[PDB]
Amino acid sequence: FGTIHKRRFRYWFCG
Amino acid sequence: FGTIHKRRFRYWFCG
Amino acid sequence: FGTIHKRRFRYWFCG
Amino acid sequence: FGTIHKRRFRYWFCG
Amino acid sequence: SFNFGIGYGTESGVSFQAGVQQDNWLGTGYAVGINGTKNDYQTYAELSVTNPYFTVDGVSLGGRLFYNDFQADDADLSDYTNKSYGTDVTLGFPINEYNSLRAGLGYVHNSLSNMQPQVAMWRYLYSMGEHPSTSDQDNSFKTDDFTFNYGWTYNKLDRGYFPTDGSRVNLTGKVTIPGSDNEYYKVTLDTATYVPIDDDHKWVVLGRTRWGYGDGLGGKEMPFYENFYAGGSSTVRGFQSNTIGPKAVYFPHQASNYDPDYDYECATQDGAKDLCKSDDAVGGNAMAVASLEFITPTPFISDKYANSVRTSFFWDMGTVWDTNWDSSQYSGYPDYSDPSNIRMSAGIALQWMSPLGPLVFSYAQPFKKYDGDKAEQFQFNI
Amino acid sequence: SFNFGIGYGTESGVSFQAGVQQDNWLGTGYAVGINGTKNDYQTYAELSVTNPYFTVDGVSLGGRLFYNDFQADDADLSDYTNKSYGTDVTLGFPINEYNSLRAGLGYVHNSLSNMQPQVAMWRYLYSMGEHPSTSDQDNSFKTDDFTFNYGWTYNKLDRGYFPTDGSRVNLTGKVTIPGSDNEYYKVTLDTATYVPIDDDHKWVVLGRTRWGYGDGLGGKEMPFYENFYAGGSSTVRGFQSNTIGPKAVYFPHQASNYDPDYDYECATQDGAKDLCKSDDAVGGNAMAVASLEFITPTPFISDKYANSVRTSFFWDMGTVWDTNWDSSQYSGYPDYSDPSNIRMSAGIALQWMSPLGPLVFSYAQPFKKYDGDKAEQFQFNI
Amino acid sequence: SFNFGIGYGTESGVSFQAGVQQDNWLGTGYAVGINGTKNDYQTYAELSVTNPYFTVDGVSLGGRLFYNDFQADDADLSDYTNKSYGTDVTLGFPINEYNSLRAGLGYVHNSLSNMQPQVAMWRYLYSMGEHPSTSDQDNSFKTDDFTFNYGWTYNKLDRGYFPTDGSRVNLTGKVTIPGSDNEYYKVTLDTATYVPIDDDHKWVVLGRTRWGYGDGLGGKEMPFYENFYAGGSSTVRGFQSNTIGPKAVYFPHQASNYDPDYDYECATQDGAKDLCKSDDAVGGNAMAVASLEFITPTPFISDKYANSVRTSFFWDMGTVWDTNWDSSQYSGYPDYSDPSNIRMSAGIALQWMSPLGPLVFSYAQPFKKYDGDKAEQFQFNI
Amino acid sequence: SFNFGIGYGTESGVSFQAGVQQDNWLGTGYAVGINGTKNDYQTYAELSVTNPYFTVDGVSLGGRLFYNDFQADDADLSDYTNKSYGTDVTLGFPINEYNSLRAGLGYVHNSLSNMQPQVAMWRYLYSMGEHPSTSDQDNSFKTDDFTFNYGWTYNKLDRGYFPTDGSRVNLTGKVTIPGSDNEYYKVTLDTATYVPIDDDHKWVVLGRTRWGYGDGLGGKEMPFYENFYAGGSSTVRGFQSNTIGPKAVYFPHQASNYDPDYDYECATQDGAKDLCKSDDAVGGNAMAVASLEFITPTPFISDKYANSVRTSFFWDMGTVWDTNWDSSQYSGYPDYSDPSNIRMSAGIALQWMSPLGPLVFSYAQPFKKYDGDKAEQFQFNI
């Protein structure tokens, strides 16, 4: 997971 | 000297 | 090796 | 005291 | 094969997406696959090739090359940034008709910029001989890894489209070869066992389990980018994908791209002095999940088109933990080294099949759950 | 005598302060003095008594009792804390009208908690048989010391109000008596020599020097709380008070009361791996200072009120060093055992006199200065 | 089979000795072997069984049980004492006629009393969480270990008593299973390659190598009783058996069974203050040896009885090292972590054959040698 | 004054001996004294000077220079050898007619070769940072010591020739000044009190005591050559001179000048393995003795010549101990740190007076005695 703040959201990129 | 951090200061107490 | 002194010798026992 | 053996004797020299 | 997509505002970014396969039934030999995904926050590209008749014996040779660039902002950079790329090459040996073995070599480069200070990541970094601050997002890291990969697959279930009896077992493992920056070992074992319950094999019982363990060698920690994550359709459904397990606890720090109109965790310009627990899942180095599915006939569908449909009542169990978490240094904080924090859910599932692949719909509700776990009661995946 | 104060917020704390004297000219004998100072970070209380007519011979007996409690925080404790108390009793013998001798006994208790790891302090602690960590502020120490104090004072300058010819010499020394935790010896010698330059004694030349040496006995180090500090109005002006000499070099460690919004030295949660040099003065076991003052008539004040004023052009020299500093173990770090790092300043001074005591105003600028030294070009003291 | 011995004084002790085999050619199945050795300073007993017919497929099952008790004195005990016992059970699977695989489980108990303080042993003990003194022989340790053992053997050389072409490769390995006190992994690989040089195969070239690596898991050290030792007839001849590699450096300590008429190493009652280097070999966690033998016809024997004799001119190379040796903490002391301290010897050898087994006579002289290495230029073994 | 001697075969050696004084009653001031003694095993030479009128006030200045070379053999050296030399200078101040004070400086050089290993000496050597073997007589040591000596003497007994009433008290002490190899302090206090019992002062009661304490500073031991010894005419009579107190216990060692026809202590070529207790007195760092003498008229002499004779019935008590003796490390060996091993003797004494000095004859028998103490029931001294 990579936390992006400007959308209040955690982004999955490891797969 | 005794460093106190919450005032960003070194305090003299040995004399 | 296990050093025994009373014979001035190193004794092999690990095998 | 200093022990000398060839006379079987203890020799005082500290004074 | 075939796919494409772009976008304009989905939560994610531009959303260029592609899944493609160039293939043959016989002759010229190559099997080629391509995956792509461009967002405001990620650029992922995977290219894969395979020769299934590398030699007369039927042995196969498969390779792949990947790039995966994540940026938590765009225009600024200067925030948590994780770039990776690398290559794999492998040989596949059939021996028994049930079995196959695999052996290969892999290389992975990983670059990190401005990662937010949290305990587990920084335990690993400390273990690697790196000492970043814990008071700011001014940090970086860069590693080249080389690994020997191996595996063994056993596939004696009588039919492959929709299994009815027998087992599929898969063991896959990694060991770093000397010369790599990271030094670790890893094993992952999937086991599935179908037992038929009537003579017509319309009612079945499926047992299933995933096991995963791994660690660093000689005092190094296992790289954080190799952690295990659980939850979702593939593992324990009823939870959000990959959210089960240890959560990040952050050090109080100055965030690099700050805006008081938005939300932050243990940011020092929000008044943070102590470290604080969060919902942010970070995975662990050990994992164990299991699942019991009672496969039943469909409760109202007709039987000749039912060869494309399957129905089951399931319960899933699962846990993820971090072996090297210090249960003593953080006394009032939960023990992420305990294996016994086993999450459990139960529900109903419908393994359908699109004309291009099997699809699992499912509903579940997690009843054994812990703080920070995110529920996802309605699940779909290919 | 008389004084009192409390406070707001002057960098220091509550600032209860008092200086008091209960005295006589003739008749009941006692001479009593009291000093007090309470801050958020210190509680200092000194009570002193003296009988100047202990016997018919004019011999005096003087004693004192003191308490001095320093805490670097305000609610937590758990940070660098230094408490001390003790007692002194002494006899003063006149013999020659110029001279006096002094002999007495003293006791001092010192308690230390959570001192920040630095080389010199911990060389001393190692020498005392104590082995604290150097990786954290979890440490403590506690000592009872007993000492025999002695001294000789020679005071043949023709007038005492404002000297004009002759010398004042003072030698004072300490030796630990058996039974004390610390074992050390110490000597301090002040010398002042006035030479008149005109027949009216309005132009004078003053030479002055301070010498100080001390060490531990039998392999122990001199206690750090007995170190010599130089700089300020009393010694070498143009420098901040007591800042001349060796500076602390810290080991990388975990600070006990941390806050990333504030500033720290070699804190491990700021990314510290090596030891780092600082501005923090810690004093030494040896000291030598000197001063040449040309006392001149005031460059435009009238002579019939000038008996309360004095003007001088001065230059001060001074050095402080640590004899047991290992110049080899810390190769790239400055040699605090070298005596030749002599600081030098020059300036102008105005020894005024308030109705209750002499006051020294002065301006100076240090021209021979070293790294870490703090300048104080404008000086005032009683 | 058959052997027996006792004794009177031949450097070693009572010398009860036995090697025995109870066996069959066909039928009842069991293969039993027994070894025994009793001295004043050791009691060694090994019992081994094997069924070569565990099932119809020709798979074998082999087990063994051993006891090995060493006492460096023993009317007193109270000196360095090392007792061990344990059990092994294994399964052997043929698959290809050239090949076999092996998998099994082992358990080992080790008790230590009064071991002499030296760096490497005590680095390991520190790593296990044990902190003995380093100033005396008052110490002890006790461990139960459980291991999974595996192996693969390839044996395609055309004839087996006296090889002429082809290779024999053997890979054997260990991994501790969870629950053991020690946690380590180990691999050992022997490789031998015969290349015939004339059409009659009377001149041959043999290349040979041994490789060994191993380490502890998660920050533990590899147990010292699993170290690799090199030197002797089996590895690098021209050296005394098992003397190649790291040597012990001892801490100054009080020996427990002292006698000034005898010889000691860094004994504090001989005046020892610093640690001192010795000849005492202690082995390492890594090892690599190689050997090139030119097999030639015998320079003066007839050819009909020569089928029991072989002659060679050889070249042996070898090194043993300790990966976790701190090259910085012991600056003036040799780097036992360097692999490049490769010993080298050359000589002539005569592989004879007694009626009950092959015998190697050999002469060699080590020409690349390092301090502490003990030479043994004249070698014999079975 | 005047004396001389040589010899042939005393038990002792050549026996050159001399006691000499060059003096005055008034006029040129010097007071000179000389002592000399040459044997096969010692060369002792002491030269002393004193000016009793250093200044008008009657203050005195006294100095001395000494050499003292002991060799336990005569041709080989290579055996226990103790050479010393040094200097003293002192000032004596009268103030009260009863009293005097003394202050001075001293220097002492001590060289040791081939001293026989025993516990106490080698505890001291270990404390000085020297680690000799304990297995042989191959050792040495060499020290330069500097000391500040002081004292106070009170002498208010009414007549000095043969006291009858009043007391003589003498306190003398030493402290090492910084720069000396050894670092120690020492105090010795003699007290004598005469109380007359009849109006004519022919029957008197004398109480008497000697006290002595001393130790090393900062972890060093008190030098062995400054120990206290008791026994003999001067202290506790009935014992051999200086034999009371701790005895040497030797380590088993190889003696350097061996001869099997002679006698040795814990010599390794006599079969010694353990340490063994002996009769050899070595003194201690603490001492306390007392004596009560009833002075009576002579039981058969006329009163007209009795002014040169005195008779007494006495009992003497005394003890010497070593404060730093480890009562735990040597469990079965006597506790030489216990003060309560008080020896006691009683007897009769005749204080005669030769024309050149007072002579004490005495008979005593020690009734409270301990192992290793040597009795000397018949005593004479000046």
UniProtKB/Swiss-Prot annotation, chains E, F, G, H:
It is found in: Cell outer membrane. Part of the Bam complex, which is composed of the outer membrane protein BamA, and four lipoproteins BamB, BamC, BamD and BamE. Part of the outer membrane protein assembly complex, which is involved in assembly and insertion of beta-barrel proteins into the outer membrane. Constitutes, with BamD, the core component of the assembly machinery. Belongs to the BamA family. This is Outer membrane protein assembly factor BamA. The lineage of its organism: Bacteria, Pseudomonadati, Pseudomonadota, Gammaproteobacteria, Enterobacterales. The chain holds residues 425 to 806 of 810 of the full protein.
